[model samples]
Every structure is written in C-alpha cells, then in structure tokens.
Target chain A: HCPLEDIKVNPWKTPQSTARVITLRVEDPNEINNLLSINEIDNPNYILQAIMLANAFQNALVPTSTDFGDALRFSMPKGLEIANTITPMGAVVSYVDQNVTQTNNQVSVMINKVLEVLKTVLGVALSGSVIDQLTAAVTNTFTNLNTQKNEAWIFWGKETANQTNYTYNVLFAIQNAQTGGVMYCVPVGFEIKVSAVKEQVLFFTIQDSASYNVNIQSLKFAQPLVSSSQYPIADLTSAINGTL
Target chain B: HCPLEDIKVNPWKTPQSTARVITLRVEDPNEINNLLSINEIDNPNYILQAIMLANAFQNALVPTSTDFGDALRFSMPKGLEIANTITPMGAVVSYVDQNVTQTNNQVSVMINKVLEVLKTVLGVALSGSVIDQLTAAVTNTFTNLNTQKNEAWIFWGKETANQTNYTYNVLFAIQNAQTGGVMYCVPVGFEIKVSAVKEQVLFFTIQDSASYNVNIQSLKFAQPLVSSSQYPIADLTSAINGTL
Candidate 1:
C-alpha cells in the first residue's frame, strides 16, 4: 500500500462560449508568388547593398537633434524606446511545402504556404502599386522596423551589452581631437543594424533521407565604421570644403 | 616584610620654587562697590534706556556700505579668513588672571606679605588725586570692554556661556537673512549683558571660633527681545525692506 494521501488532479474545463477560430488564407496565391519571386534573390552583396540603402534612407528621414529632449522623443508600444535607436536592414525568406486535410475530407497542396503565412503573421501586404502610396507604405514599414531595432539596442544596453562602449567612442574621438590640438577635426557616426538570418540545423533519423532540416534564425547586425579610420575623414572634409 | 623592591624614602626632597607671590586686587574696590550698589538699584532700568539709545544710534548710523566695510575690515589674525557676510557692531573683552609666588623659610608669611604689598603693575603712578587716576583707569577699562563687546556682537553675534552657542546663533541669523526666512529676530537694540556674581560659601569652626568664606563667581547674561516666534516673518519683511 502506498503511504500517500488522496491525490487530486485538475480536469480541463470546456469553454463556456466557443472561441471563434478565423481561418485566414491568402486571397490570391499567385500574387503572393509574384511578390516572393521578386524578393527571393540569393545575392548577399545585393542584399547588403539594399540593406545599406534602406538604412541610409532611414538615417535621412529620422530627425537628429543636438538637444537632449529631441534626441530622446521617440515613443512606441512596449520596446519602441529601444527600437527607435536601431536601423532595420531587411527580412529573411525560407520556403517549405506541406499538405493538410480540411474538416470536409478535402486534401490540398500548399506551395510556399509558410511565406504567405508569415506575410500575414507579420501584417505585411501590398495594398496598391501607386508610387506615392508604395513609398508611404515602405516608409511606414521601415519606421516600424527601426523602432524595433532601437528597442533592441536599448534592451541590449541594459542587459549583457556595454553601454559605455557606445558612449566611450564619442568621448574618445573628442579626446583625440583635443589632444591633436586641432581647431576642427573629423566627426564620427555610429549605428547598429539588425537582420534575421536562417541557420539550418539537422536532426538525426533512422532513415538518412528522413532527417529533418530546421531553419533557426535570430535578430543580429554588423556594426561598421566604428572608428575614424574606417571612413575617409580627409575626403569628407574636402567634400564639405568644396575642395573635392 | 617587603613584598617588592627594598627602597628607603627620603622626606627632605620636596619640590620648591623661588617665584614671588602677588595678589593684585582691582585697585579701586570701594569705587567698584559703590558702582555695584548704585547698579543694584538702577542698572536694569539703565540698561533698558541704553538699549533705546543704541537703537536710535543705529538708526542714525543707517549702515551705509562704507560703514559695513569698516566694521567687517578689521585686523584679523594671520591666516584667519573673515566670512564675507559678517555684520558690524562693536567691542569685545577677554580676561585671565595670573599669580606669582616666592619661596622662603617663612613661606606662608612671606606669601601673605608679598600679596599685601601694593605696587602699580599696569600704568605709571601719576601725580593727581588717586581717585582721578582710578576714575580714568575704570573708564578706560570699560571703554575697552565696550569696544570688544561691539566687535563680538557684530562679528561673532552674541556671547553666551558657551562659544558653541554663540557660533550657532550667528550662523542661524545669517542663514535666515540670506534665505528670507527669519529664524532669530534680534532687534537693533538687542543686547546680552554679562556680569560675574560672587556667591559666598561660609565655613565656621565652632571649637576654634573661626570662620572663612570662599566666593566662587560665574559670568552670565540675558539676550533681550530675541523673538521666540517660529519663522520670523516680521524680521524677514524688515530685512526685505532694508530695515533689518
């Protein structure tokens, strides 16, 4: 006999009111396919260039204030305070195919269904193709991503990242200028860009071909031009002086 | 039986000194007594009248910037920094007594004789009514005392039994004046009078039919018209009006 008191377990209670399950599907699979086709080139260099252009455009649109209040004025829900400080590059795409049966015993094949699902999940849909409208949509999307990036930067600064490393670079430049005894010197700009990338992980299976390949991704970025030497300070000065 | 080191005590090796003893009493004890008797009858009223006169005198002085500087700019001890915010009043007095003795075979009698011997110690013995010289001496002593008193009141605030108390009062007054919140409303004629009063303690030997009295004196005085009101609003108003 087990020396235990009477055991009790919690039983799941059925919903008093049934939750409405909305089955959402892409209205036009062909349109999604076209969009994906336009987005899906595997040129890393082009991708990097696109990322830089997007960042540069964002850097121009975002207001920079010498005053403290203006610099800190970006506000958004949850982590937006950190997000506003970041420059978002681009998104990643990974396609997979699977079959599902409907409640009415109808089987259907879904092609690139995950991309459609993700597009819906991320709330990104092409509304219209008028240049101005498209520009506005793209701008809004970039702003949202930038906000998220800023939030991430703030979160990182507060957590394992060294905020002093970011702050000290400015101080170091100023000190260098002062030590050099120059009236005017080069100015440095610092930025953090974040992107999601796919990493393929393999799972072992008895049948070698049955092994699963899982795509794991994370938000990370490359920080460039961290020092004055990284950029052509002399050229920049000459350009500003109209001597170039 | 010796518990420790064996040593012989010599009784003749006692301490001795050859310095002459002198007990110089205040020269005109009778005059001082007369003044005291008169003061006992009328000093309180005289002091009150003096306060009124002082208040009127202060009003006449009107404390011009020059007068303020003159009061504050005194010959201070080297390395002593005078606080810039010091106010001017007048006079201060500090006194100490010294006695000297000469050793001899008739030590007690010689000491008594030396004490009894009258000799002018401070100033020349001039040709005139000893009373006139005495009067002059008394007047000069009081003048010096008054000068010291004024200096102390102006620079050091009030004299209390404890210097700590005086320092605290001065700091409090200055702080209140600066912050426009009155802590001590010391009126123009506010004065503290210090006098040393001797209390006689008598010891009588019935068998010998002899008596001795020891007079132990102490100095103390009262600060009149110091406002006990919390946060001296009236004084603050006067301060703002340049009447304080």
Candidate 2:
C-alpha cells in the first residue's frame, strides 16, 4: 500500500524508509523563481496552502488510475529548460521564455499532484511494472503538452515589433533529440535596416521563397551526444538546401 | 424442478413405460399380469408415499442452493428401474436366476434407503453432475462386487470336484426333428449324458478366471431366433464379440 501524507527527501543522504518517493527537479529556474516568489509574497502559510492546492489540481488532472508512476520512470525528456544561473538571493533564474518557464512549472505541479493522488487512490507501494506504465503515460502527456494550445501567453519587447520584412527559418539542431527528431532554429539577429515608412510593424515572412535555411550554429544540442547525433539545424539545412 | 413423482403411462403403448410397470411385476403378480407382463401394480397410496419420499430425498440431496430442476432431471433415471424379457418361458419358470432377481429387488430397497440417508444428512438438491460423479463412484463399488471376499462366495457341485482327479472329457447329445437353428433342440424329451467319472466329490476353486461358453444349440438359443426381428441378439453378439 502507498503511504499517505507528505513525502520528505534528504539532499545529502538517503533516508531509510519502506515507503517510496519520486522526486522531480525544476529544470527551468525561472519557473522555480516564480514559485518561490509566490511562496514568499503570499505568506508562508498561504504559500504552503497554494502549493497544496496546486498539488491537488495536478493530482486531479493526471489521475492515478491512468498509470502515472510508470510514465514518470521511463518517459524520455521531450525538451530541456536549463537553469541559467543561481542568484546570491538564493533564487534560480532561467534564460528561457517566461511562458515556457511557467509551462514547465505548471507541468511539474501537475505531475506532483498526480503523484499525490496516486498515493491516495492506488495506495502508495505500486508494482514496478505499474510504475513503468505510469512513466510511459507521463511521457505521453509531455509529448502532448508541446502541441497543446497554450491558454497562457507571453509578451516580447517592442524591439521585436520593429523587425525588417525578412524571413527566418528554424529547425532542430539535434538528430534523434526526441524519439523522432528535434526542432532547429535559424540564426536570428537584429537587422537595423531603414524601412519605407516610419511606422514600425513586426513583419514575419519566409525569406527563402523556394526553401528555408537553418544556421547550424544556433542549434541547441542535447548532452552525451553520439556520432549519429547530427545537429537539428544541420538536418534542417540539408533538407531545405537538398544537400547531404 | 423435476416432478417429485414417477410418471404414469398407459403401458399398452409406451415401451419404457411398459418396462417400468413390468419391473414391479414380481412384487405383485395377480393385479399386474398381462400377456407381455407389462402392467402397473403400484397402489395409489404406495405411489403417494413414494412421491413424498422422493420429494424429501430431492430436497435433501439438492438443498435450496442449486437449481432443483437440474437435480431432478439427473436423479430420476437412476431412481427408476426398467426390465425387459427376450425369451419365451417354457418348462423353466423364469430364465433369470432367483438369487439375481432377489438381489435386483434388494437394490431398489437399498437405493431408497440411500436416498433417505442423503435427505437426512445433506440438505441440498443433488446436482446432476454430482449425481453423475456419485454414479461413477458407485459403479466402482459394483465393479469390485465380484472380487470382494465378503460380498461374494463360490460354490461347486460333486461332479466339478471329480473332474480335477483326471483329465476328463464328456459329451452330451440330444436330437431335434425340427428345422432351422431355432428348433435345433426340442424342449420335450431332451436328454443330457455324462460318460466318464472319477469321484463324486466336487472341489470348488475360486481363483479369478474368465471362463464361460454358450452353446447356441441350447433351448436358450430359441429366444434369440424368435426375438431376432425385435431384439436382434445376433447383432448384439456380433458387436460385443467384435470388440474382443
């Protein structure tokens, strides 16, 4: 049977207990900061309650009946959101978009809620096989998260609106990044060219009329890369330019 | 549920019903004798008592736990006895051995006693499958009947004892002036002879043995000839002998 109540973990030493616990790390520091910010401003008690509420919401969304443990164990990392730096104030920051950071945090909250619900609904000590299935289910949820419409939006700076009527191609830099392939991005930089009118408008278009070119340098590569792991940008460039 | 009563039939038409009625002929002859010896002698009072007993037995064997109907259908066949005769009775009062006939009657009584015991001990409707298994168990008992020292005894006549003293051969002949295999032996004035003898004392040996032979020319053969169109003994003999 699964244990009911809070799960505690030791950062330096392994705890001796019969009960099992699954701990997930916040890959995106900005999301952690947001969570921390909310925790600090809302008062410790309210923050704890909000955390509990978020946990509950997450549990409710990813039901224990759907094999959550198995999904968490075996699921492949779909995308990486790296923590850029740790501030002197003990807050972790991320260079990723605010919306992306929040999305990753939301997913983490959802996973934690699911784990809590699983403990209550299925009872804590699930079989390893069931855990594997739960991991797969979580992976599926993550895969879907990438495509699912984001009801939350992020605002970019005004400089982004004054871009020239030039097209930019994006592609995945890493081959076999996911089970299929990764998304790559073309080299993007500020082009301060004079426009016909003074009015500034963000004009986004495909620059290559025939095909898109992805600059290999801008590709975000995954760790422990293999010889077969061609950057997503190179793959996209090869595809668009019809070059091997 | 099976009707807790034996079904009555006008024996003039139904063979199985006729057999059923004739089965009781030995018990009460005066009120039940017919040319075919197929008539009922069961008194209405006796039938009522039998039905009451049957109901009690049925209830005991198959308590209210199971479908009574299935138990009834299964138990009735074993509960009822059927009798058939294939030969004509001449000088011999009855072809059936008196002891065998008596024992058969005793079987009916034993069965009734068993039923009564079942009712008293087990309060359940005896399932057909259970009854079938019971039948198999009882059949094993029956198979061991001849082998059981307590159940059976051996007997021998004086002539049988003398035969062990020397290698002996004897022949008996009787002439019949009738035609066909059926008339090979006339009932009247038939003579049997013994040519050699050592001593009159008979020594009975009870070692297990399969030893028997039938002379088709005997008076017993006439029945098969006469009833050939009806019982087809020749076909039966062929079938049984074919297996060996």
Candidate 3:
C-alpha cells in the first residue's frame, strides 16, 4: 500500500473538472517573457503546477467533484525560441514565445512528473524493456520536436499510442506511434485500477532554434465542472486568497 | 518509501546466486505428476515459491551474498500436455510432460508472479497503454501456443523484447519482441533501481491442445555461489528438512 498523502496529490489530476477548455496563449514575445518571468513558469514542473493551480482556481468557480478523465489534449506551438535558435518550422506566427536552453524540457518535465506520481503512488518499478521504449519515444520527440503547427498531442492511455487517437475511453493523440509492443512492466498477477490519468503524446517535433512572431492560441480545458450549492464558495475564496 | 518487508521478498531474486544454470525438466509423465502432486505445484505462485525455496535450500549450501542480476533466462518444454491433449509439437522427443487445463498457465503464472511482486513493492500502476501492449503479447502467445520444439523464449529487460536474445547485460530470451514502444508506466519523476529481476519470454507459442510423450530436461542454473566455511550448513539442513 502507498501513502495516501503521496498518492492523493496527483499532478495530472490537479487540473480536472475546472473548464471545458482552458487555453494558454502567447501571441507576442513579451507574453512569452511574461510567462517565463513568473518564477520558473517555463520549468516543466512549474508549468504542471501552474496548470493545476489555474484549474484549482477555476474549479472554485463551479461546484463539482474533483474528478478528471484519463486523457488530456495538449496543443502547443510548432516550435519554441530557445537560446535564439529556430528549426525548420520556427516562425513567428507559429511558435510559443519562450526562451530556454532545452527546447524539449517542457514536455519532458510534464511527462516525467506524471511518471513520478504514478510510481510513488502505485508501488511499481518499470521493467528495462519499458524504459527503453519510452526513452526511444522521448528521443524521437526530441528529433522531431518542430514539425507542425497547431499540433494535437493526445495524452493517451494504452502502452504505446499506436498512431490511433483513441484507445479505451480516452483519445491518445492525433496518431498513435507503434502497433505491437511489449508490456510497460511485468504484471503484478492481478489488476489494479489507476484513476484520473493524463498522459501527453507529442505528435510533432520540437524546433532546435528560436524565431520571432508566434501566438499562443490557448490551453483549453474541455469539460466543465458541475455547478452546485454544495460547494463551499466562501472557504474556496479564503483559500484562494490565502486568507484561510 | 516502501515497506522493508514488502520490498525485501522479491520473487525474481529468490533464486539468485544459487546456481549457474538451474533447469526444470519433465521427461516423463510420472515425473510431471510427481511435481503436480506436491499441492499447487502447477500453480504459478507455487512454482515461483518452489523455485525460491529450492534456491534457498541451495543458498544455505554456500556462504554467498544474496544478490541477483537484472535478468533471468527461463527454459521450458516447447509444449505441454494438458487435459490429455497436445499440439503439433507435443512429441516424446520434446515436451514438458505435464497435464493441465490451460497450456499457457505455467508461463502466465510465472509472468504474473513477477509483476505482482514489482507492483506490491514499488507502488506503481501499469499505464493503460502498457497494459494493452502486454495483453496483446500474451494473447499472441496464446494464439500460437504450439509451433516449435526446443524453442527458446527470453525473459527480456527492455520494454519489448524485440526478438533479440539480449538487451542490457542479461539475456532476455532466445529472442526479443518489438523495437519501439511506450513506457511501462508514466515516469515516477526520478529513478528507482529495481535490484533483482527475472522476466520470462516464451519465444514460441504454447500448444492449444495436448499430446503425450515428453521429457523433463535438467533445469540449469548458470552461476554458482561462493562456497565458504561461513555457511550455516547445519541450520540449512534443519530448515530444509523442517526440523527447525
């Protein structure tokens, strides 16, 4: 059994039930700096935390149970501006206005955070085969980081995305990666249900260099939380304002 | 952190350092029944425990430390005789002389046991993608149960075995499965080394039906423990004979 405290604060579940569509948009270079200036906003962990905090604030607006679906759809710019470098597709009109040393760090951080929480809470270690497969995927993502504009990266549910958008109940990405694959790890003999999962599948490659002129269209939350009187709006307000 | 007790008893590590190559063979029907009559011998968990206990008894024979490599290679009869039936390959020259309702139960039991220990001790859940991929592999193993004689199945280290005989250092099986795949689960944020491991890869399919006439070849252990005077030989004998 895992510690409830360790498992309860799932980074993936932090953004659940807040909005139907929540968009993170950056149309100008200044906006990119604005996000970056927010004390490690560009840091992958910070981005995840910010996403969760934003959702938490939004969640207070509605009265709903804290439940999230298994998958999430992330739409990022085709390229990024890291250390004044731009790849083949790093154009102003189609880029996230952010400066960083590593272009793929954001997605890597996001992916790593999800893995961390899962391992800590579930008490399972990855088999070597699984690690290699995932490593290849991330490597491939790095290789082709900047390939398209307005790419739809689906956080899938199955072992490998398999180029299919949907697996069980959730959509993985625009296209799955491989067909047949090995298990993520050894089986534990029985089934253990994992709830409120969000896995990211980056469909395109990241840009190696930076270019100007890009618009952050938006980070959209697809579903809306239920509105009810049962929500403690006053307590939520106090908590949000740090007055509690 | 995990419970010391929960994480200590690793199924894969149970047989470590006992033998250089320990093999389990079934050359005759009576030998099969002799194994079966031992109460849950055919049960996957029982097989694992028996393997462990046997090694433990052997472990007492030497004064070596209890450390295992990252992988273990398992060799079994190409086919099994279950319910008075056999597949095309179930001939006297090459078969595990055992009767069972399901042909793949032994491998399945072994596979599931390893998974159980990993999950229970590590506190990680299998991602949906990983689960599906593994499920497909197992399904395929079921589909082509009996196709070869003296086939080599590998318990690989990487995510998918990729039809190769080796991955890191340990030999997975006679062959690996796939090339690229997703991770076993989301990353747990950081690395947590799993010490002792034993994964099985059945290179050939199990028999759908059963036939008679088989051989229990010798189960071989590849490595031998360090022999020293420090070994508690008397205590081990007492424990092995149940006198302790």
Top candidate, metric DockQ: 3
Give the lDDT of residue A45 in candidate 3: 13
lDDT for each residue of candidate 3 in A106-161, tens digit (9 for 90 to 100): 43443343334323322233212123222323333222222211222212223333
What would the TM-scores of all predictions be? Answer: 0.12, 0.12, 0.18
Clash number for each model:
26, 36, 109
Per-residue lDDT tens digits for candidate 3, residues B113-215, read 3333323322233212123223323333222212211122211232332221221100111101111111011100001111112122322222122211111
**Candidate 1 stretches greater than 4 Å from native:** A1-79, A86-114, A121-244, B1-244
Best by TM-score: 3
Q: What is the DockQ of each candidate?
A: 0.00, 0.00, 0.01
User: Per-residue lDDT of B18-105 in model 1, one digit per residue for the tens?
Assistant: 1111001111111111011001101111212222222222221211133122222112121011212223322111111223233322
Report the Cα lDDT for residue A20, model 3.
9
Candidate 2, residues B76-128, lDDT tens digits: the string is 11212110122232121111101111122322243233333322222233212
Query: Of the true interface contacts, what fraction does each candidate have?
Result: 0.00, 0.00, 0.00
Candidate 2 vs 3: which has more TM-score: 3
Q: Which consecutive 10 residues in model 2 chain A have the weakest lDDT in total? A: A33-42
